[PDB]
Amino acid sequence: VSKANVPKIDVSPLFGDDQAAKMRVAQQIDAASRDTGFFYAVNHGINVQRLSQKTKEFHMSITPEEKWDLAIRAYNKEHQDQVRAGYYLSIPGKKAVESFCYLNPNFTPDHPRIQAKTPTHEVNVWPDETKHPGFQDFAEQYYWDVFGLSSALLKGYALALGKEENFFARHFKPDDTLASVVLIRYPYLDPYPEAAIKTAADGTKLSFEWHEDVSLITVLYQSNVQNLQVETAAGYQDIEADDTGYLINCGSYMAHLTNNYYKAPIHRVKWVNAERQSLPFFVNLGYDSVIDPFDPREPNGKSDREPLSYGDYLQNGLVSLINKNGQT
Ligand SMILES: CS[C@@H](C)[C@@H](NC(=O)[C@H](CS)NC(=O)CCC[C@H](N)C(=O)O)C(=O)O
Numbered sequence: 001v002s003k004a005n006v007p008k009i010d011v012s013p014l015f016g017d018d019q020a021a022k023m024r025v026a027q028q029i030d031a032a033s034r035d036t037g038f039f040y041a042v043n044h045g046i047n048v049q050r051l052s053q054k055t056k057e058f059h060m061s062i063t064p065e066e067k068w069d070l071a072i073r074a075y076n077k078e079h080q081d082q083v084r085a086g087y088y089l090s091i092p093g094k095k096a097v098e099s100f101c102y103l104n105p106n107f108t109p110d111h112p113r114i115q116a117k118t119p120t121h122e123v124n125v126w127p128d129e130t131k132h133p134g135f136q137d138f139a140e141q142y143y144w145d146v147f148g149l150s151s152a153l154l155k156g157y158a159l160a161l162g163k164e165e166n167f168f169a170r171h172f173k174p175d176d177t178l179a180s181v182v183l184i185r186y187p188y189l190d191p192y193p194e195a196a197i198k199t200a201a202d203g204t205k206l207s208f209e210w211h212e213d214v215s216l217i218t219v220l221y222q223s224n225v226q227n228l229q230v231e232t233a234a235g236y237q238d239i240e241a242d243d244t245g246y247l248i249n250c251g252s253y254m255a256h257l258t259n260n261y262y263k264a265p266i267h268r269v270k271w272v273n274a275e276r277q278s279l280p281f282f283v284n285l286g287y288d289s290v291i292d293p294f295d296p297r298e299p300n301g302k303s304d305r306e307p308l309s310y311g312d313y314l315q316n317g318l319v320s321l322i323n324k325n326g327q328t
């Protein structure tokens with residue numbers, strides 16, 4: 001397969017007050033969004049080597065007893081409130097992947113949306129402090145660091161579409177965002193179970209099938225082991241790895257609001273027998289957020305699509321993705 005066009009864009013102007021420089025970044029985001037749908041964010045300000053080291057100290061020290069105690073509902077019937085947040089177990093001999101998901105640290109027991117039991121809002125669960133010293137405080141601080149990067153990126157997407165810079169960011173707030181971090185471990189295994197390997201129609205061995213993302217945008221750190229592919233008009237292409245930057249793409253909410261001007265790219269995960277990390281931040285809005293759909297290709301900007309609230313979008317999308325590609 002040939003190599004996918006994935007440009008490196010320096011996103012540092014998006015943090016400052018130089019309006020013309022921000023426009024130059026916006027144009028590069030527009031070009032990448034109309035082409036393969038992917039780019040690397042560089043000069044982002046975040047210490048990704050320390051993120052990798054802290055995440056590795058956690059995955060490698062957590063015990064089977066602690067994983068049952070933190071497990072989501074799909075693995076532990078006792079934990080009916082845990083649909084999104086908590087531990088997603090491996091199944092030795094059948095399923096290789098395992099992961100930990102956490103939500104907004106402001107979703108405390110006194111938060112009005114947790115009091116009302118609104119779908120998609122949960123209070124995070126954490127391992128014992130004495131067993132994992134410093135982990136919960138590191139992980140909460142990381143949520144705010146990648147939140148800050150994502151707010152800057154959202155300024156560049158708004159400019160790219162001909163809008164004012166707070167068009168998306170106004171709907172992305174500390175007190176109510178539905179955004180999530182997932183710390184995915186893909187393990188080295190000897191022998192690697194064949195039941196954990198899927199085969200595409202074209203014969204390619206996979207760990208996760210073709211899909212579009214459920215997000216507005218996705219903001220991803222990975223290790224330096226090549227595995228991602230993107231569908232283009234020329235067929236599936238390889239995305240090169242870069243463990244110093246963040247890989248960015250649009251999810252299906254952005255394709256809805258823009259009448260498919262910025263498509264949600266179809267992508268998949270090749271099977272590789274290597275110990276590695278996939279650490280996505282899914283940029284989601286608030287439960288009642290609505291952006292009216294438009295079409296930047298039409299003279300009058302009007303679209304034949306209906307408004308959809310972010311909450312309804314997120315709940316149905318996460319269920320459909322489990323029915324399509326399986327419980328992770
Ligand atoms: C290249 S796709 C990627 C970054 C990842 N998959 C995923 O993270 C898959 C597909 S996007 N996403 C999901 O499984 C959605 C998880 C939602 C989360 N529990 C929440 O509650 O917000 C992986 O397999 O590396």
Ligand SMILES: [Fe+3]
Nearest residue numbers: 211212213267
């Ligand atoms: Fe994805």
